[PDB]
Design a binder for this molecule. Structure first.
Ligand SMILES: [Ca+2]
Length: 182
């Protein structure tokens, strides 16, 4: 059970394109038609101390979607593995963050520096767990041989649905993102 070394989000607003969010309890996401007000989350883990051969690996998050004006249907949020692990949580801003187009969350590098791992279904109004089996990526992909795992969290499908996952800045450790190594 590993907590991130790094977790943050970035946000596409003129007031916050140069802002860092590593102090927040939230890993925000949003994907809009135009890309304004998009948010992307990022995680890093260090698996280099895992004694033994990894058999299964899972990413677990805790999150929800949120609106005062409508009930969202379940929203599928994409998880990518990134080659780029060169950043720390305090480095990333919208303007300085990897694997997306400059005006929206649209992914850059698919199949090359960004590996699609799957989507997690996020539900409305109440925190819940999601989990994605990422065994093949952790066990086999070139990105993870250096022991530093980098993940991106985004809406790639323009749902125009705000939400967040809970970060390492929450008071309860049980809400943190978790990389589970068997
Ligand atoms: Ca790596």
């Amino acid at each position: 059970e590993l907590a991130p070394t790094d977790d943050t989000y970035v946000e596409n607003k003129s007031s916050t394109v140069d802002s860092n969010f590593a102090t927040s309890k939230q890993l925000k996401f949003k994907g809009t038609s135009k890309g304004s007000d998009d948010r992307i989350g990022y995680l890093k883990f260090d698996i280099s101390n895992f004694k033994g051969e990894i058999d299964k690996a899972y990413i677990e998050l805790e999150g929800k979607t949120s609106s005062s004006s409508e009930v969202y249907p379940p929203i599928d949020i994409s998880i990518h593995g990134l080659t780029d692990d060169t950043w720390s949580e305090t480095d990333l801003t919208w303007n300085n963050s990897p694997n997306h187009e400059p005006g929206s969350a649209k992914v850059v590098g698919l199949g090359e520096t960004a590996t699609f791992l799957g989507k997690v279904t996020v539900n409305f109004g109440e925190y819940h767990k999601v989990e994605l089996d990422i065994t093949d990526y952790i066990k086999n992909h070139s990105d993870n041989k250096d022991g530093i795992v980098a993940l991106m969290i985004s809406d790639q499908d323009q749902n125009n649905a705000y939400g967040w996952f809970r970060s390492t800045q929450e008071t309860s450790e049980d809400t943190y993102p978790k990389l589970i190594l068997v």
